[PDB]
Structures are given as structure tokens and as C-alpha cells.
Amino acid sequence: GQKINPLGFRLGTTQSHYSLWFSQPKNYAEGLQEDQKIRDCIKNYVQKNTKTSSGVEGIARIEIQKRIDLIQVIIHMGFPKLLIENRPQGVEDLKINVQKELNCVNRKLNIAITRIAKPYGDPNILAEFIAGQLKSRVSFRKAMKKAIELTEQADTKGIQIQIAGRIDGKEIARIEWIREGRVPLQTIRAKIDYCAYTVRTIYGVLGIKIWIFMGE
Amino acid sequence: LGNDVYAMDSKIKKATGFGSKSKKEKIRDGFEENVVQVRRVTKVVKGGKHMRFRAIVVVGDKKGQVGVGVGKAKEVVSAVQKAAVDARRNIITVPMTKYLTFPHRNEADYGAARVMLRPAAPGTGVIAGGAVRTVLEMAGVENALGKQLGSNNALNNARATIVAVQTMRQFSDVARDRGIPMEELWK
Amino acid sequence: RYWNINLEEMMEAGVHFGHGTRKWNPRMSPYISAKCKGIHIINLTRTARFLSEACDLVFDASSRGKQFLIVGTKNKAADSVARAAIRARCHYVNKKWLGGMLTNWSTTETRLHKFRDLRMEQTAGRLARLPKRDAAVVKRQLSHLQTYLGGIKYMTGLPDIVIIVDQQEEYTALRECITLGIPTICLIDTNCNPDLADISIPANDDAIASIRLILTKLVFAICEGRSSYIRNP
RNA sequence: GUUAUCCGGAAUGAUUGGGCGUAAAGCGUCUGUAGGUGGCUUUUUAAGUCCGCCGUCAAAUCCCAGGGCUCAACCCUGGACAG
RNA sequence: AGGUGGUGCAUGGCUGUCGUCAGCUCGUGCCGUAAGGUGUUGGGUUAAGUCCCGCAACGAGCGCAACCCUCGUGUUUAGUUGC
Ligand SMILES: [Mg+2]
Ligand SMILES: [Mg+2]
Ligand SMILES: [Mg+2]
Ligand SMILES: [Mg+2]
Ligand SMILES: [Mg+2]
Ligand SMILES: [Mg+2]
Ligand SMILES: [Mg+2]
Ligand SMILES: [Mg+2]
Ligand SMILES: [Mg+2]
Ligand SMILES: [Mg+2]
Ligand SMILES: [Mg+2]
Ligand SMILES: [Mg+2]
Ligand SMILES: [Mg+2]
Ligand SMILES: [Mg+2]
Ligand SMILES: [Mg+2]
Ligand SMILES: [Mg+2]
Ligand SMILES: [Mg+2]
Ligand SMILES: [Mg+2]
Ligand SMILES: [Mg+2]
């Protein structure tokens, strides 16, 4: 059967939004467009400037709040050792490009980076991690179990990991998954962090879904 | 009387959580596990085929201590492990002679597995078939003749071997039983 | 060391008789004695040697510092057991015995963890801040956990000496100790096989009096052994 | 390397070494002739049985101990368990 | 480059369906040579493997229910553009 993205299931309950602004219905389309353009840019930049210097860059999410004057981008990020340490700190080097994209009329932009303390208690990061290890042609069993380890030693109450595709380049696709601890998906009161990631291998695509349960 | 909360939290901290404490201790028990057989047995459900792995595994020290155990799981790894744990609680000792061999000739019976062991001269090594040979070898028996007659099931042959070498009487003990000095029976 | 037994007191408490001759295990024919009115009479000269070796091993075991369980689940023996254990300061099972108490320890002990949380809850008085469903539920948990964990609730770790009443009804106790490498010191009536116990004392089933006699001699041995282990460590 | 032949593995014709309630397999049931096996005690005999000694079972081969072709295969000397 | 060109039997995502049916399983133990079983069955009761008794099983997890929205009764507060 189909589940609901357990994100979207608690909305205005145990989960906030990401884009925090308001607009009159007409402008709403344009504004939406604008968010998309910068989320795209800021994803690209960091991808190319960190994977050139060979590291694992968690970009956990991007919150955008628009105020009439200044629009503010808050990057939740797991290891900004790759964005700060470089000489043109990501702050300025991005501030310039993003401010090129959206517009500079009546809008000036501010970037702020936040350190998400426990990187393995965030699904998105973890999934990118498994993505790396699988792109490296490690067997998926090992990958899964390492992830479970890292996470549970990183402070987590429950986790469910699911990997789907042609696993191990084998010709017939399948679905492998592991539940660990306790994952209520139906309890709305449960703080649930989900994420969806896609992987490009020699043998084609691989989906990863990760569920993580942080308590009630 | 000390308070209930701190003493029960003492038995709580001394019995450690299985979600915060990882597992590798087993080479501290001075043992080695050998996977004899891996099979995929199946339960069948309205959905389809529900696949499990059976593992037949034997443990020894190669020093004169051996046991068998059988386990079942979804993945090779977990089955293997349960197999190990089961064997470790089933384990026995094989009577050895100064040259590392059997006191005497013996047969054994389990199911349709029949097993024949007889001692060998030093320097002949262990000649046998799969179950019997891995069990023997893992016990540390250096020189033995063995043949399994009757069936071939890996598992029953393992068990059988164990029943064989369990009923092995060592001379000191037959001298103790009969109530006769060693030198008299030697003759 | 000596113990308190004579043919006269064993006669008094009524140990020497056992179940009808249609009910008997011939496995016990080696040490039975006579048969009267369709009721069996069991040897007391065997009973005394076994009761002495029982109290002696009980004494050595207490003095070295080993831990004791007692078991019987009958209606009368249950009332005698709470008091036997309290007088000897040991662990007991009187109420319904749960399969797996010994062999499956891990899960048993988690069940103890949550029982301890229930015991802190109840005395804290934080069960007054609940819905009525929550309080009656917490009280189900309590009722059971008292029946099952009451006599063992002190003991942490695996018990290495187990004492038992009437092995006929107690099959699982015997099985679990057979399995785990634990000695059983057990009461035999004319119907039960002398396989299942390490030291098996010819005894009486139906009599509260026989139970009282042999259990009191035994708990007296546990108590003097308790003074000797309070001395040696 | 492939094919043919034979023994093995094959306890798959089984003395050592299997089976016959349901897997191949107990005559439909008895009576009984040949044949096989058959209780206890003492004595006899000595056909089996056992132990010693002798004759023989050719030489070559196999087995043990030396020797000769530079080694080995091969040849030569001596001797013997089996049965 | 571009392909709404081939392969949904090479795939991810996404969705239907049996069915909003009450099921599906796992850990430790115990029974069985083993596949497996027990737990989950029995007596009651529920919209429900809901819940309670009993039972070599004791617990847990995903389901159910609940926490979420809207409509039903009241109270406090706020009064324009609505009264
Ligand atoms: Mg599904
Ligand atoms: Mg047979
Ligand atoms: Mg064979
Ligand atoms: Mg043949
Ligand atoms: Mg034959
Ligand atoms: Mg046959
Ligand atoms: Mg037929
Ligand atoms: Mg037939
Ligand atoms: Mg017939
Ligand atoms: Mg006919
Ligand atoms: Mg006839
Ligand atoms: Mg005749
Ligand atoms: Mg005759
Ligand atoms: Mg005769
Ligand atoms: Mg000749
Ligand atoms: Mg030679
Ligand atoms: Mg030479
Ligand atoms: Mg010659
Ligand atoms: Mg001859």
C-alpha cells in the first residue's frame, strides 16, 4: 500500500514549514519560483566546491524567510568544515550569487549557516552517507549496518531504513529494509524526520528512504 | 537500608542496555567457529515464499573441546551467530591419547546417520568426510579414521560423531570401573 | 555438624504415608517400605539419610554464600513458603509459577526492571494524577507482577540452589534447573520419579504437616548456615 | 585429453556388512517328508577344534634385509609371515 | 546538443487493488533429528490479535484505537467592514 510522506502528515502540528514567508495569491507563484531558484543555486555551489575538496557535506535543509526588506537563508548543515575553512567563506561567495539570482530591487539578502550538532540524528545526512558508501560499491548489508551503528551511537530512539533498486547490480530489482527500535508512523504526536534520496549507479538508480523517530 | 532507586539503578547500570552496547566479545572465549553448511529453507505463506537460512556450525578450540549447534535466521550472518551461541551451550570434551587420537574403535548412531571412528598411527592425519571431518578436526583430534555409513545428512552426522566421541572410555577410567590396575589391562 | 531428626518426630508429623497403590511409580520401588489399605508407606530410614545429606549440602551451600530459591505452588504449601523464606531470609515461589523464570533470564529480568519502576510509582503517589483507566491498568500490571515477581524481587543474577515441593506439579522448575546446571532438593511422594532431582527426599504430598516438618528442618539448616556465612565473609 | 575395458567408491546381491507394519518385500492357512538347529548331568571317543614336529605347495612375482648398473626403473643374493 | 524513439519484465518516485480487512512478524526461551511449531492457540468479549481470564511461554515492534482537522453545548476575551 502507499503511506503518506510522514513529513506532510504532521504539518502545523509537530513540524514547521521551511519557507516561512507570506504573499498575496498573485505574487505567490512568483515567490515560489524565487525560492526554487535559490535553493537550486545554493545546492549546486556547495556540491561542486565541497566535492572538489573531497569531503562529506551534509546540507540538511534550507529555510527561507522573506521579509519586505531582507530575505534570509538559513542553511542547516552537518559539517561546515568544507564551507567555512575555504578562503572565500561560503557566506560571501554565495551571498553574491544568490543575490544575483532573485533580484536586487527592494530585496537584499542575508545568509546564515547553522551547525546541526548531531549529524547522524538527521536522516538527510545519513542517507547521503549511505549513498556515498554504495556509490563506492560496498555491499549494501555493510552500508546499512554501519549506518544503524553510527546513528544509534549518535543518540536516536528509532530508525527504519529502506533501499530499493537493482541491488548489487543484479538484474532483477528488489526492496531491502531494516527496522530498528520503535518507529510509529501513524502517531501524529511523534517527532518524525523523514527523507528521500536518489542514487545514480552503473546499474541505474537506487532509492533510499529513511525514517527517524526522536520521541513524543 | 539504602534507597530503592539507587540500588535498582545499580542493578540497572550493571545489566547494560542492548541498544547502547555493541557486540563483539567472542574471541575472548578462546574459540573458533566453523560454518559447515548453509541452506535456504522455506516457509510458504499466502504471499509467497518466505526464505530463511539454516546454518549448521561447529565450534572447537582445536585443543580437545568441541560442540555442534544449529541456527536459523533471515540473513547468513545472524543464523551463523545463533548457531555459534547454541553450540557454545551444548559443548563436550573428546578423550585424547598422548599422540592426539582415539582411545579405541567406536560406532555411533543418530537417525539414519551411522558413524565409524577408529584410532590411527601418528602421521596419518584425519581422513574422513564433511561433517565427521570438520567436527573431528575442530576438536583437535590429529589422527583418526572415520567413515559415515548409512545416511549423508551433514547435521545428523555431526551429532552422531559427538555421540561417538562422547562414549569413548579412557583407560584410567576402565581401570577405575573394573577395579583393576592399568598394567594388567595393557597386557 | 548435626541436625534435628529422630524416628519419633518423623512418625509424629506423618511423613511415612503416600498415595494410593493404583497411582504409584514403580521407579520408586527400590526404596518404598510397605503397603497398607491401598495406601503406600515409604521408608523413613532412607528418608533420614536423604534429609541429613540435604541439610548438609544446604549448610555448605549457605555458608559458602550461594543463593536459595524455594518452590511450591499448592494452596497450603504456598502459605508455608512465604514464612519459610522469610524465616530463612531467602527467595521464594508460592503463587503461580511462570515458565522461563530460570532458563529465560534476560526477559524475566526486564520484567523485573519494569516491576521496580511500578514499585517506585506506587509509593511516590504519582498514580493519583491519572485517568481511571490508567490507574486500573497500572494496577493490573501491579497485581500480576506481585503474583509472579514477589518472592524473587530481591534476587539479581542466576540462582544456584533451588529447593522444591512436590515435583509432580512442578515439572518446569525441575526441567529448568535440569537444563541450567542447578541442584534440586526435592520432595518425593509415591507417584513421582526419582530422576528429576539431584537430592530427592522421600516425603509426603497431601500433608501440610509433612511439608511443615521437612521444610522447617531444612530452613533451620539454611538459618544455621546463614549464621556461618554471616561469619565467614 | 577423449573413447573402450575391469575393480573401486556401491553397505547397490550385505560372511565381515542390509532389509520385509505403511517405502521394493511375510506364501491365504495349516499338517508334514528330506534338510538345518536343539535342554541338563556324568563317562567314552577324538571327527571337527587346538598346540608341537616333519614333508610339500617349482623358479620368477608380491613382502622384508643387503648388493650391482652414476640414481631410479630393472637385475642379483638371502630369508620369511600368511593360507 | 536534442529525441513525447525502444524497453514499467532493467529501474527510482508516485499511485491503484485485495481492504480501513485485522492481520503480519521479530528477540530470548522451550518442544521437534529437521522443515517447522509454540507465542498468535483454548474459555469469554469486542468495530478490532479490542480486552480479560487460562496456557512453556515471556515480552516487544509494525497495524487497531488514540494524539490531527471540520460540525455539534458552554465559558473568558476581543468588537470593524459583521452585529
Ligand atoms: Mg507496504
Ligand atoms: Mg537403523
Ligand atoms: Mg557412503
Ligand atoms: Mg560390493
Ligand atoms: Mg547379513
Ligand atoms: Mg535397503
Ligand atoms: Mg503403497
Ligand atoms: Mg508394500
Ligand atoms: Mg500372514
Ligand atoms: Mg498359495
Ligand atoms: Mg510343520
Ligand atoms: Mg525330522
Ligand atoms: Mg543332533
Ligand atoms: Mg548342550
Ligand atoms: Mg615361489
Ligand atoms: Mg631394498
Ligand atoms: Mg644402489
Ligand atoms: Mg628371491
Ligand atoms: Mg604352511
Ligand SMILES: [Mg+2]
Ligand atoms: Mg541524449
Ligand SMILES: [Mg+2]
Ligand atoms: Mg510492475
Ligand SMILES: [Mg+2]
Ligand atoms: Mg475494520
Ligand SMILES: [Mg+2]
Ligand atoms: Mg524462536
Ligand SMILES: [Mg+2]
Ligand atoms: Mg534441538
Ligand SMILES: [Mg+2]
Ligand atoms: Mg496467550
Ligand SMILES: [Mg+2]
Ligand atoms: Mg496469525
Ligand SMILES: [Mg+2]
Ligand atoms: Mg504460527
Ligand SMILES: [Mg+2]
Ligand atoms: Mg499451533
Ligand SMILES: [Mg+2]
Ligand atoms: Mg465465545
Ligand SMILES: [Mg+2]
Ligand atoms: Mg497454548
Ligand SMILES: [Mg+2]
Ligand atoms: Mg493491539
Ligand SMILES: [Mg+2]
Ligand atoms: Mg487510527
Ligand SMILES: [Mg+2]
Ligand atoms: Mg463554529
